[PDB]
What we know:
This is part of a larger assembly, with chains A (160 residues) and B (74 residues).
Chain A: H1 6-19, H2 22-38, H3 41-44, H4 52-63, H5 73-81, H6 89-102, H7 124-131, H8 143-156
Chain B: H1 3-9, H2 15-18, E1 34-35, E2 38-39, E3 53-54, E4 60-61, E5 63-65, E6 72-73
Antiparallel strand pairs in B: 1-2, 3-4, 5-6
Protein name (chain B): ATP synthase subunit alpha
Subcellular location (chain B): Cell inner membrane
Function (chain B): Produces ATP from ADP in the presence of a proton gradient across the membrane. The alpha chain is a regulatory subunit.
Amino acid sequence: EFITVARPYAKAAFDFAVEHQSVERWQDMLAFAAEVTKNEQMAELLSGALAPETLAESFIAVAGEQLDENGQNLIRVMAENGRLNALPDVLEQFIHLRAVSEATAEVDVISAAALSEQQLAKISAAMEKRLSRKVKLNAKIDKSVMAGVIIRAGDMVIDG
Amino acid sequence: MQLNSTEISELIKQRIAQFNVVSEAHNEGTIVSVSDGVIRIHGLADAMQGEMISLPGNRYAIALNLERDSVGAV
């Protein structure tokens, strides 16, 4: 969960992986791995194991070894490191690898969520709300917005 | 295995590739890791803390306190 060890990971992920294009390919392999630790017996059995060799062994082995050899010999790398203990850190950091690479997004304020990928501000944003259509903001629609301006307002009711 | 809970299905058949593994003992278990008679404790996980426990060859191994994973004991 340090994710910094996994930072060096996701580093080597875009790096060797995307270099191998395993950023996607071991996005697949990686996916299967988080599936492996996701196995709770494989969690229940996660660490009793002194030999990390035993771990990568029963790991690729158990799970079905969808990891690359970059991830099998890397399975020696992190498994041996035992930093393999934390799967998702560099998984969301790899999601941050390809995704950060691809980043365009949005966040709905005073609205039900948006997340419309906007490479630029207001780019897909004003295009979305303008594009609304939706325009309802349903989650945060009214009480949230009207309590936003009226939030500032009660903030004036600070005068009491 | 594949996608939902198949991930856990043939992670139980991928497990079950390996599935001989996951298990634990209470008490039973073992003294996980030790030097000089204080031990990380393996197995025996959930137990009354400080239950003097029939100890090697003899003693009632005095359960020190729950360090949840591997209890230390006297």
